[PDB]
């Protein structure tokens with residue numbers, strides 16, 4: 323559809339817009355380059371592992387690898403919908419979001435190549451619950467925005483992408499990674515990438531909060547919609563978490579070798595903690 | 608539509624793909640930040656000008672300011688269409704393309720604010736020909752890809768965006784800027800931004816060449832389509848160039864003040880030169 327004007331010809335940018343401030347922060351804090359990470363020690367660590375120690379780590383790399391690729395493809399509709407609404411600053415920020423997710427896909431792929439599991443097909447570690455989030459509810463809530471950019475539709479998209487997938491599952495997976503391999507001294511390069519990802523993630527979640535909150539503020543009925551959609555997806559969050567935990571408990575050889583006290587009951591409380599505190603970053607008024 | 612698999616879970620990235628190599632170059636060469644540019648001298652230069660010297664420069668800032676905002680919004684469909692075709696490396700590169708265009712909009716807007724013409728409405732300097740490219744043919748060729756991603760549709764989009772708007776008009780405008788203000792010693796910050804833009808542009812054009820060429824290679828009938836669409840748009844290219852030139856010739860006070868020998872006949876041969884050499888970077892086989 324035609325352009326009926328431009329905002330930097332009639333006016334300029336709203337330099338005070340929060341998303342323009344988040345865009346500035348993204349440029350300042352987002353220079354990291356996955357190609358600069360040294361994985362030579364990760365290749366050694368992975369080689370050194372038993373075959374059952376090798377398996378131990380893969381499920382979590384599987385969920386992250388697919389999940390990074392999901393959001394890289396699935397954030398595009400949000401940028402379309404905000405663009406077409408004239409939210410120039412949001413769009414400017416989303417170009418950093420999309421580039422972040424591209425580096426995230428690059429990072430996990432370079433690790434896989436480095437430790438020798440590139441060809442390996444990690445799809446096996448996506449159970450039914452994971453697919454229901456990432457293969458289904460995520461792409462549907464985002465793609466919807468190409469035809470339906472109502473406040474409800476925008477809230478549901480930010481809830482699934484930013485509050486659940488990033489704000490709940492990715493946050494908990496970063497924690498999990500540290501709680502396990504930071505303790506073992508394993509996979510230094512991967513953990514360097516995880517810290518980089520975690521930092522980017524903070525801005526991803528902050529776009530979600532601002533997007534959800536700016537719609538709640540127009541009509542508090544949408545607060546209810548937000549809590550509802552969060553609760554709708556919790557079964558699949560926790561059923562993927564339960565499944566990964568069951569995998570962890572029958573794969574105990576890396577825990578023993580490295581004297582890791584893998585407290586799965588605690589990881590599970592972190593997930594529950596993340597989910598509830600995302601709810602609490604949305605105010606009903 | 609559901610995700611039916613992921614390329615960094617079954618395999619990895621194609622590290623040898625040209626667009627993955629262009630993506631790597633973009634990250635290496637694309638760290639510049641418009642917020643780091645010092646425009647304090649540009650504010651002085653613009654203040655120092657007569658009112659008729661002030662007008663002299665604005666038409667070209669008008670076309671660039673709107674034009675940067677056009678491609679920032681209008682490149683999204685290309686990334687959608689390539690994403691949905693599974694061209695992961697192309698998408699990775701396009702995240703840098705879209706972020707480049709965001710910085711380009713930021714750059715021109717920060718200059719406008721710096722020299723005091725933010726509120727000023729530069730739409731007046733878009734004649735009928737400019738609007739036919741930027742207000743019409745560009746958004747239509749890109750938006751089409753949301754429903755029609757045929758090789759014809761993809762060629763036409765890359766031809767209008769990358770070969771004409773960037774490869775012909777933006778290239779010639781960078782030249783023009785140097786031929787005029789590099790000579791005067793004016794607007795150092797703006798010219799620093801133009802060199803940054805010009806460098807980004809090289810990758811933008813190279814994605815267009817690769818996109819057009821990889822489709823020609825499947826069926827040489829599309830070479831004809833490429834030449835045809837290039838020729839279809841030339842009238843509007845040159846009619847905007849003629850209009851800017853007519854503006855320049857009745858606004859001769861900055862030329863005289865600064866002893867600039869503004870050879871408009873030469874700018875016009877540069878445009879013609881750019882257009883023909885874009886045609887020559889597409890091979891018929």
Ligand SMILES: CCCCCCCCCCCCCCCC(=O)O
Pocket residue numbers: 382385386389390393423426487488491492494495498526563566567570589590593
């Ligand atoms: C054993 C404890 C389980 C903890 C939960 C781990 C979840 C693994 C990560 C999967 C989701 C990754 C989504 C990435 C989001 C993004 O890159 O923006």
Ligand SMILES: CCCCCCCCCCCCCCCC(=O)O
Pocket residue numbers: 667670671674675678708711772773776777779780783811848851852855874875878
């Ligand atoms: C007087 C000589 C005229 C020379 C032609 C000048 C054209 C001005 C620039 C307008 C198009 C800018 C498009 C930007 C493309 C991009 O940012 O990718």
Ligand SMILES: [Fe+3]
Pocket residue numbers: 393423488522523526
């Ligand atoms: Fe994210």
Ligand SMILES: [Fe+3]
Pocket residue numbers: 678708773807808811
């Ligand atoms: Fe460009």
Ligand SMILES: [Mn+3]
Pocket residue numbers: 390393422423426519
């Ligand atoms: Mn990510």
Ligand SMILES: [Mn+3]
Pocket residue numbers: 675678707708711804
């Ligand atoms: Mn540009």
